[PDB]
Structure formats: structure tokens, C-alpha cells
Nucleic acid binder design. Structure first.
Lengths: 62, 57
DNA sequence: GTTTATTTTATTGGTCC
DNA sequence: GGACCAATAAAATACAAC
């Protein structure tokens, strides 16, 4: 377990949202572009989209 | 909105029983006090944070 | 100004090709 | 092996009551 969670930067988050608008699913090539461009882990990025996906589903509340 | 004192005592009763809670328990517990498993789940989640804030009671 | 409920990282364990 | 899902926790926030 452990792995104390760390709040991402607004800059990074913005770029994250930016691309998620383009595609809800991410290509193994964009991920490498996105990571380097935001200094994160591909695994982290995949986790973001992995999690971002569930957010949208929750908007079903609307 | 505030949870009942009796309900409260019920919670801490089980919380001393176990910091984390089995789904089997959440049942009895939610029904036992008519709550929401989300709610019961949420209390325990926030409950643990209290314990990390023990400052000589 | 102090004391329930939502949102955000993150791992775990199931699937499906 | 890689992608996806959901269940679940903890840290961080938020917002109401009091």
C-alpha cells in the first residue's frame, strides 16, 4: 500500500484535461508525449485517464 | 444534517471492534441504524483520520 | 473558528483480447 | 502482456452547522 498520494500541478492537470477532451482513451504513443511534456509516469498518466473515465461516468448524476 | 447519539455510540462500538469493517458488518450496521453503506463507509473513513489526530484525547 | 460528504491520487484484483 | 473495468483506501477539499 503506502505510496502517499501527491495533488498534481494545475499546469499538468490542465494539459491532462486538454488531451482527455481530445480522446477519452490514450494511445501508447501520446502517453509518452504527454508524460515527458508533464514530467509524470506513463503508469501515472494511464492511472489518470483510468480514473478520469470514472469521473465522467459519475456525471450521470446530471 | 447530524447523526444520532445512539447511532454514534453504535459506530464507535464497532470501531473499537475493528478500525476497518467487513461488508458483512456494514450490513447489520447500516440496517441496524438505517443508514447508507456509503455513509457508514464514509464515517469509518473519516473516523480513522480522527484517530490520526489524537492529541492526548 | 471548530467539528459529513465529495474529489483526487493510487493500488488491487477481476476480466478480455 | 497490455488494456480495460470496479472496489477501495487515504489525502485533500469543501461546506453546513454550531
Amino acid at each position: 500500500g503506502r505510496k502517499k498520494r501527491i495533488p498534481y500541478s494545475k499546469g499538468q492537470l490542465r494539459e491532462l484535461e486538454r488531451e482527455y477532451a481530445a480522446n477519452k482513451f490514450i494511445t501508447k504513443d501520446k502517453r509518452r508525449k504527454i508524460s515527458a511534456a508533464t514530467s509524470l509516469s506513463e503508469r501515472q498518466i494511464t492511472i489518470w485517464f483510468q480514473n478520469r473515465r470514472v469521473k465522467e461516468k459519475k456525471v450521470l448524476a446530471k
